[PDB]
Scaffold this motif. Structure first.
Motif, mmCIF file in Angstrom:
data_model
loop_
_atom_site.group_PDB
_atom_site.id
_atom_site.type_symbol
_atom_site.label_atom_id
_atom_site.label_comp_id
_atom_site.label_asym_id
_atom_site.label_seq_id
_atom_site.Cartn_x
_atom_site.Cartn_y
_atom_site.Cartn_z
ATOM 1 N N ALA A 31 0.820 -1.207 0.000
ATOM 2 C CA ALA A 31 0.000 0.000 0.000
ATOM 3 C C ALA A 31 0.855 1.259 0.000
ATOM 4 N N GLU A 40 -8.437 8.014 -9.228
ATOM 5 C CA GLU A 40 -8.996 8.094 -7.882
ATOM 6 C C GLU A 40 -10.133 9.105 -7.793
ATOM 7 N N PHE A 83 -18.510 0.135 -10.995
ATOM 8 C CA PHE A 83 -18.040 -0.249 -9.669
ATOM 9 C C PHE A 83 -19.134 -0.973 -8.895
ATOM 10 N N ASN A 444 -9.177 -1.460 5.472
ATOM 11 C CA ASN A 444 -8.508 -0.732 4.400
ATOM 12 C C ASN A 444 -7.161 -0.218 4.890
ATOM 13 N N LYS A 446 -5.449 2.184 4.192
ATOM 14 C CA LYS A 446 -5.422 3.629 4.391
ATOM 15 C C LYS A 446 -5.827 4.031 5.809
ATOM 16 N N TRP A 546 -14.227 0.452 4.502
ATOM 17 C CA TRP A 546 -14.529 -0.341 3.320
ATOM 18 C C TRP A 546 -13.454 -0.177 2.251
ATOM 19 N N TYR A 547 -13.423 -1.135 1.321
ATOM 20 C CA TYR A 547 -12.526 -1.049 0.171
ATOM 21 C C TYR A 547 -13.109 -1.602 -1.128
ATOM 22 N N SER A 548 -14.013 -2.578 -1.086
ATOM 23 C CA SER A 548 -14.336 -3.382 -2.255
ATOM 24 C C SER A 548 -15.526 -2.827 -3.032
ATOM 25 N N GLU A 549 -15.732 -3.399 -4.223
ATOM 26 C CA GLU A 549 -16.928 -3.108 -5.001
ATOM 27 C C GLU A 549 -18.183 -3.651 -4.322
ATOM 28 N N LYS A 550 -18.071 -4.786 -3.626
ATOM 29 C CA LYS A 550 -19.232 -5.358 -2.952
ATOM 30 C C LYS A 550 -19.701 -4.474 -1.805
ATOM 31 N N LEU A 569 -14.340 6.343 3.845
ATOM 32 C CA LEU A 569 -13.612 6.933 2.736
ATOM 33 C C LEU A 569 -14.563 7.165 1.567
ATOM 34 N N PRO A 570 -14.302 8.168 0.734
ATOM 35 C CA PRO A 570 -15.194 8.448 -0.393
ATOM 36 C C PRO A 570 -14.940 7.493 -1.546
ATOM 37 N N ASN A 572 -14.567 6.762 -5.667
ATOM 38 C CA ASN A 572 -13.859 7.500 -6.708
ATOM 39 C C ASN A 572 -14.811 8.384 -7.509
#
Ligand code: SF4
Ligand code: SF4
Lengths: 623, 624
Positions: A31, A40, A83, A444, A446, A546-550, A569-570, A572
């Motif tokens: 990362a 992004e 996404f 995540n 981040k 969160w991080y994923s498309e799901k 987190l926002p 993209n």
């Protein structure tokens, strides 16, 4: 000091130092390399080779439109649509597999599988219109339910079957807006069609179909997955278990199941309970075969069997670093391909079981319902053999497992209330429980691991807001000791009273990522009983890490169902002011809820609590 | 201006690029000039989750070799290319699904103004797909049963798509072993979106195999259902004459330009312009007639079935508005540049959208469905007449004179020209008069001088006695150069010219729109079945010299996956992976019997396609 900033747990800190001295790179390391733009913000578009296009805010006015003439609103909304489509396709294929597994049981072509919950089968089939579901033979009833579910994966419906659970006012609103999900696969395909060059070039139109696509997940793919899994493998009931890496045993064969599909992991557990297989473990010098779960397939085995969970998303690499992971059994989704390389650093066998989840360099033992009993038996044997090659000097199982309570399906919740939602409604009217928030996030890199999840959970239960936990938050809440009845002491006065009255934790574990459909069902039941919309209920949803498309698809169908959803987190989408305003504000005018992007977990509790209070007022209640 | 002459080979395009520059109008070439600058072009940029985005670079420190999740360049490039293909299949998949819904509306009696124009094809297609008593039952009953079959191919309970039976047995057995057999049109798309998710499919061979399966679900499912049902609903094409280029617009008439891919709207638009009350409204406004002209694929559709003249191909769509004579643009969906809405505002032109799927901010939306199309299309032609009364005559400049073409070469028309059997065609190929067939299916791309590669490659191939089958944008290219007429046999080789003169056909056969590339699959499968060989044994080829869209990549992929060597003018965004690139160019030859070819030189591309045709003639035991 960097290792302390990557997580808040001692077992993770212990293995980060272990991998550092052994020269093993982790997800946090990669990362840092990838931190250094247009993608992004969602303003990069690669949907055709007329040219990769970027939309910039330039002084000279160039690069304001794509080659085809698309503006930043269309480009941002299209990437966001794809996404959500990828997130919905994730849960879509999962539900379809469960349909196939039930059809194999009905045809009698799945040795070792059964209809574990015949009573739920008859209830679900009767709810969806199967004639004489109460009295016909179970396999005939299952076959008719299989036909119904498959038809929601067709192209001839006006609304998905389970959409009837939503209140009438919510369904009429979906009709007016054009959001009614018609087919699970069809919305995904139409999204990919709309996001093609020169098709849908209106960001409002694109976001409305994103909502329709995500609603086809929550009320279609995920809900079919949850309900059919309970039919095949049992409806969850409250039970005790343990969490964190301490669930691994030095004296045992440690099999870690990873992914989302209970069809494979349930048969893995059955194989480790066969007498001849348990003999092979003792012959190898092991006291037993120990099964522990990872990610969503772990949540499923936790809910229905009480199998302890080793950890959540960012712990998956660290579990192999313990040196005690004898095998990893993977199916599909959210399985980092770096696990294959980290497993090569040890004795661990990385086994893939699905035709959809292929990993270069892995040992592929493809599992299907017709051969699962034989194949999973063969897979457990590879784990016993790998155990004999374990290097004892590199073993370090850091912590002691923490007790948790799991299995809070809607069936288990209503049974605790005496068979009706009335005591729950009474507590909400009285103000003892001011609201509900479903925390459904992941991890995540981040964000310091589980710092936001645990803080937000603590903040909400303090304010008499009950927390419903799914996915990664199960490990986060459990490690902090909030998944046990004794954790009522850390809640507010009203919530602690209700929890002690029922003997339940202030944080209810309701399952995996597809089990967020349980939250949709519960909200729909409460709104129906009260005669109001879901957008009138004091409820909220949050995905702090969160991080994923799901996760985004889950967040999108919660908003479109009237559930105010917070994101840590926002997505993209910040490259477009119009798309961003629509997600944060405009959607409130349309569906009755909106997205909230807040990295401060305490400010996020303030926002979620504010919406809960405003909705208590609209019900004519005191905050 | 030397820059203007370098962007096209056509005077009607140069004349409007001068006009657009004079009036301060920016075209697609001007926006392409601004978007020249990188990782996404190599395919090594991944945006599938907000654990990145991740770029795979090559640095001496060895950093940034894997994504945050650990994916390498092979997986990232394959997943990007997989999602690229799925986007193309989805374009054709929804187009085919709408054709099903229209036919169901006709069958239910809920589509005023629509009929079953080709009942004989309906009964034939229904019998081929297993409808009981398709020859004798009432037509609407037969149509309803065929609708169920097509809908089931958009379900999730089948093992193979319905039309896949047209393929040779050896081709179907090969697909079975590889796991490429298309099961459901939407399902492969959904599974592709699932596989490309983080932590699902991380093997580039597995990903490309499903890319082939996903594209085959287009060519043998979505597109083929679209083509065959369109012939049922609006008529099977027959050879006829028409014209192309901007000269088809008339100064004295109301010019309606249909744009997109869906004939459901444009066929009903055309019927509305022939209603007496509507023709009166135009005459009351001072117009001599109502003139409908086609653009993109919907123009190809009206060309094949009605002979309606085509205004131009992809890059001509902006310039047709610049003529000042475009009174309305009626759009449905796909490949419609949203800059047209702004350019139309520079004139009197009405930009009308008709589909819930093709929405354009700022456009006039008159949504069309089968149950209201007759009324709605009447309303749309009236808006064109009203906009006609506001036309500025000082800004009118229709540059060139239309070129004669011949169109309508469906497989039904081809077999009818041969006496009802493919035997004369096989005899010419065995004799060596026709050395092979190549389908040119490309678009336009601002990186390439418009139609320079399409026309050169078309001239090069027919010169070498290789017949060219034209679909899509190449229709305008071949027509403008005068190759779509029987007299163009003089520009073909000796053997091809003889066969063309015997049949009275051009050396370049126009077979329809982009979805009508399924016609080429049907023709190839018919020859391979007759000869008792595989499609990979036929002296055939496919080429897309100037492609740009996801649909072109999907068409190229299901041609390769069916055994047709496919040439591409430009490479897909995959060069960031040597393994993915080698698989596309070479590895697939060992698996499916064909591979991709990337060659920007049209003459070298003719050399490559001719080499494979020669190699396959040798394996058939024929003179090369
Ligand atoms: S669709 Fe438009 S914006 Fe996107 S890459 Fe193609 S030309 Fe550029
Ligand atoms: S899927 Fe992997 S490579 Fe793609 S953005 Fe996410 S972490 Fe990066």
């Amino acid at each position: 000091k960097t290792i302390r900033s990557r997580s808040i747990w001692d077992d993770a800190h212990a293995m980060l130092e272990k991998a550092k001295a052994e020269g093993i790179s982790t997800v946090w390391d990669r990362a840092a390399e990838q931190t250094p733009k247009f993608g992004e913000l969602g303003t990069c578009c690669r949907n055709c080779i007329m040219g990769p296009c970027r939309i910039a805010n330039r002084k000279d006015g160039k690069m304001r439109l794509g080659v085809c003439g698309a503006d930043a609103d269309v480009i941002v909304a299209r990437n966001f649509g794809r996404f959500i489509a990828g997130g919905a396709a994730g849960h879509s294929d999962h539900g379809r597999d469960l349909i196939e597994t039930l059809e194999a049981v009905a045809e009698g072509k799945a040795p070792g599988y059964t209809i574990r919950d015949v009573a739920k089968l008859r209830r679900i089939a009767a709810e969806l219109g199967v004639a004489d579901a109460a009295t016909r033979p179970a396999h005939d009833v299952a076959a008719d339910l299989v036909t119904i579910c498959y038809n929601d994966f067709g192209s001839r419906r006006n609304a998905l079957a389970f959409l009837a659970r939503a209140p009438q006012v919510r369904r009429d609103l979906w009709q007016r807006l054009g959001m009614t999900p018609r087919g699970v696969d069809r919305e995904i395909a139409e999204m990919m069609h709309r996001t093609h060059m020169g098709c849908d070039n209106d960001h409002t139109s694109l976001l409305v179909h994103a909502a329709r696509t995500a609603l086809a997940d929550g009320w279609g793919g995920s809900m079919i997955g949850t309900e059919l899994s309970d039919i095949l493998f049992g409806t969850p009931r409250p039970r005790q278990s343990t969490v964190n890496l301490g669930v691994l045993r030095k004296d045992a064969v440690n099999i870690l199941v990873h992914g989302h599909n209970p069809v494979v992991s349930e048969m893995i557990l059955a194989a480790t309970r066969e007498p001849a297989v348990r003999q092979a473990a003792q012959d190898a010098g092991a006291a037993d075969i120990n099964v522990a779960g990872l990610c969503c397939t772990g949540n499923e085995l936790l809910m229905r069997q009480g199998i302890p969970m080793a950890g959540n998303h960012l712990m998956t690499e660290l579990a192999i670093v313990t040196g005690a992971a004898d095998a990893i059994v993977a199916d599909y989704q959210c399985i980092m391909p770096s696990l294959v390389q980290i497993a090569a650093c040890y004795h661990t066998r990385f086994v893939t079981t699905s035709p959809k989840g292929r990993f270069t360099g892995a040992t592929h033992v493809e599992v299907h319902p017709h051969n699962a009993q034989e194949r999973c038996r063969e897979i457990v044997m590879l784990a016993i053999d790998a155990y004999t090659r374990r290097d004892p000097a590199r073993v370090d199982i850091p912590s002691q497992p923490v007790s948790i309570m799991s299995g809070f399906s809607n069936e288990a919740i209503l049974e605790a209330l005496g068979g009706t939602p009335k005591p729950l409604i009474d507590a909400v009217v009285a103000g003892q429980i001011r609201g509900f928030v479903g925390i459904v996030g992941c991890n995540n890199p981040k964000i310091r691991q589980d710092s936001a999840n645990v803080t937000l959970t603590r903040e909400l239960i303090r304010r008499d807001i009950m927390v419903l936990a799914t996915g990664c938050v199960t490990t986060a809440a459990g490690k902090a000791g909030l998944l046990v009845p004794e954790a009522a002491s850390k809640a507010g006065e009203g919530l602690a009273a209700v929890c002690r009255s029922l003997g339940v934790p202030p944080v209810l574990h309701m399952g995996s990522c597809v089990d967020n459909s349980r939250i949709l069902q519960l909200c729909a039941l409460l709104a129906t009983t009260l005669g109001v919309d879901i957008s009138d209920l004091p409820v909220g949803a949050s995905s702090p890490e969160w991080y994923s498309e799901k996760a985004a698809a889950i967040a999108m169908y919660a908003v479109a169902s009237g559930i105010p959803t917070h994101l840590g987190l926002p997505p993209n989408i910040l490259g477009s002011e119009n798309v961003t305003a629509m997600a944060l504000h405009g959607l409130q005018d349309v569906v009755g809820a909106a997205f909230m992007v807040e990295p401060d977990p305490v400010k996020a509790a303030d926002m979620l609590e504010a919406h809960i209070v405003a909705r208590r007022a609209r019900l004519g209640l005191t905050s």
